[PDB]
Amino acid sequence: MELIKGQALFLELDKKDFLSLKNNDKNIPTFAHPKNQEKILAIFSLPYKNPPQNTKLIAFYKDKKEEIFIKTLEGNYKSEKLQVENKKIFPPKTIQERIAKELKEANAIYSSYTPKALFNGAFNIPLNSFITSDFGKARTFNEKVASYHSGTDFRAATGTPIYAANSGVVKIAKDRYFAGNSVVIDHGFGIYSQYYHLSKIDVKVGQKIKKGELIGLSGASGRVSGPALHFGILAGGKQVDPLDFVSKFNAIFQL
Ligand SMILES: NS(=O)(=O)c1ccc(Cc2ccc(C(=O)NO)cc2)cc1
Ligand SMILES: [Zn+2]
Numbered sequence: 001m002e003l004i005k006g007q008a009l010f011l012e013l014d015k016k017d018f019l020s021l022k023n024n025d026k027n028i029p030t031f032a033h034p035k036n037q038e039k040i041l042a043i044f045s046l047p048y049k050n051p052p053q054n055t056k057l058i059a060f061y062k063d064k065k066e067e068i069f070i071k072t073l074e075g076n077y078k079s080e081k082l083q084v085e086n087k088k089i090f091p092p093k094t095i096q097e098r099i100a101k102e103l104k105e106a107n108a109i110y111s112s113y114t115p116k117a118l119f120n121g122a123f124n125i126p127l128n129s130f131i132t133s134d135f136g137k138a139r140t141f142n143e144k145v146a147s148y149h150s151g152t153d154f155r156a157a158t159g160t161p162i163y164a165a166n167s168g169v170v171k172i173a174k175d176r177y178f179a180g181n182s183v184v185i186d187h188g189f190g191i192y193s194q195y196y197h198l199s200k201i202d203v204k205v206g207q208k209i210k211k212g213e214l215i216g217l218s219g220a221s222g223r224v225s226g227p228a229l230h231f232g233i234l235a236g237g238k239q240v241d242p243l244d245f246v247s248k249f250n251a252i253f254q255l
Helices: 093-110 242-253
Strands: 002-004 008-014 018-023 039-045 054-061 065-073 079-081 131-133 138-140 145-148 152-154 161-163 168-176 180-186 192-201 214-218 229-235 238-240
Touching: 008 018, 008 054, 008 065, 008 242, 093 168, 168 192, 180 214, 229 242, 238 242
Parallel strands: 002 065, 079 138
Antiparallel strands: 008 039, 018 054, 054 065, 131 152, 138 145, 152 229, 161 214, 168 180, 180 192, 192 214, 192 229, 229 238
């Protein structure tokens, strides 16, 4: 199989006698296929930055094992050559402490695996607008990736109401260093949606939020280049192309 970097893929396997699914060390969780009772699914994701050239997964059954090979593609993402160089940014201690603390808080959440669906059918978009900046835009020195846009931006004047893309539980609902006012929602099975740069937050940590319910108003918090909504999806432990993942998830779970 082939997969473009920064994308997720739904793998399908026989349910009967299945014991586990592995990638070296790492176990990969599985969930039911919602339409076919003889199948199970797993989500597999390639990082954007520095992915392997190929990946070999193994599914262990009682009777036998099944090898899955996946080749990484580069895709056709927009990229610009960086001119300066990263050097390294030297922020003041107070900011470095804040960033490092927020990072830890995020990793703990992103590696919680909720083994049931908290969603309700298909994802919807968080507002009815259009994309102003795409997933995957890269900056390169030495044709190696220095940075990339890890979500997608939708046009929004400050104050545009923003709606949950699907049901779940809120896990983050506060001002954070680069993200501004942030909401992150757990949808189950390790799928998280992300809403950044809000001017207002209307939900609370631990709250159960239904699809289409209001979660805030858009703003420009944390942003240099003007107001906009940044929407992200993290799944299989990585940031992935949100519109790509939404169309693949919906093809399977549309009620
Ligand atoms: N540790 S932290 O402060 O919570 C933290 C660090 C990095 C990021 C990634 C990120 C941020 C903003 C944007 C963006 O809006 N593009 O328009 C995209 C990605 C998110 C949160
Ligand atoms: Zn963005």
